[PDB]
């Protein structure tokens, strides 16, 4: 009960509604202060280049070492404007790669493949470069978790080397003998805009735990705030 209720309080610190979903084994746990979140679909926004990932290198339409090169048409912010790899464009959440890639892939290949591996509501529409900023595409936080738990396990729908491409990308930092890995994701295209950070640890025995945060990102809240809890979350759970 404890556990629970400071992690409540993160959340409202923060002045916004959040939930954090936590999977070890087959169930999950949900915390914060706004559970029905748990089961709330949310658009994924960048969390979705995690599947964007196994299905262009599964489908051949990706490697790990290629550049995908700017053509120098603006981007949304500078630091997009370079040549990137899909693990440096995951890293800095380029979204023009991911669409590249998008386009690479196609609205056939993608909706089967999406729907294959029943991500969300699985729905992807008509337009193959934006479905997961601004729908159709929803996920509920729950469906985030597991998603991660599986890719953390390598039993996603994929090959294990594509699985293991894609965790090395995740790659965040070890920290006390964990290690990190989690992509964010920030919805600011849809109103309310929605806020993730969905990944995993590994404990140093081997032990996986998943976890999706999932706030609403108001005006004024850094974008900080989601590994900032996340990870004070996790710590108070005895996970990091």
């Known amino acids: 009960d404890e556990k629970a209720e400071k992690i409540k309080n993160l959340f409202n610190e923060v002045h916004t509604t959040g ?33 964007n990932a196994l299905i262009g290198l599964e489908h051949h339409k990706a490697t790990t070492t290629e550049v995908f090169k700017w053509d120098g048409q603006k981007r949304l912010f500078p630091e997009w404007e370079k040549d990137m790899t899909l693990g440096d464009a995951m890293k800095a959440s380029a979204i023009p790669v991911y669409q590249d890639l998008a386009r690479r892939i196609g609205l056939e290949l993608m909706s089967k493949e999406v729907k294959r591996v029943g991500y969300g509501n699985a729905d992807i529409g008509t337009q193959v470069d934006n479905f997961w900023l601004v729908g159709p595409l929803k996920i509920t936080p729950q469906q985030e978790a597991q998603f991660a738990y599986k890719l953390a396990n390598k039993t996603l729908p994929f090959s294990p080397k594509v699985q293991d491409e894609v965790q090395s990308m995740l790659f965040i930092e070890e920290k006390n003998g964990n290690k990190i890995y989690a992509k964010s994701g920030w919805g600011w295209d849809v109103d309310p805009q929605v806020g993730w950070l969905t990944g995993w640890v590994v404990q140093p025995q081997g032990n996986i735990v998943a976890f999706s945060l999932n706030l609403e990102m108001k005006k004024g809240i850094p974008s900080s705030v989601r590994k900032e809890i996340t990870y004070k979350s996790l710590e108070q759970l005895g996970i990091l």
């Not at 999950?28 to 994924?44: I, K, M, W």
Request: neutral net charge.
């Open 19 to 51: 939930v954090l979903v936590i999977q070890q084994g087959q169930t999950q746990q949900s915390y914060g202060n706004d559970l029905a979140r748990a089961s709330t679909e949310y658009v994924p926004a960048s969390t979705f280049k995690m599947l």
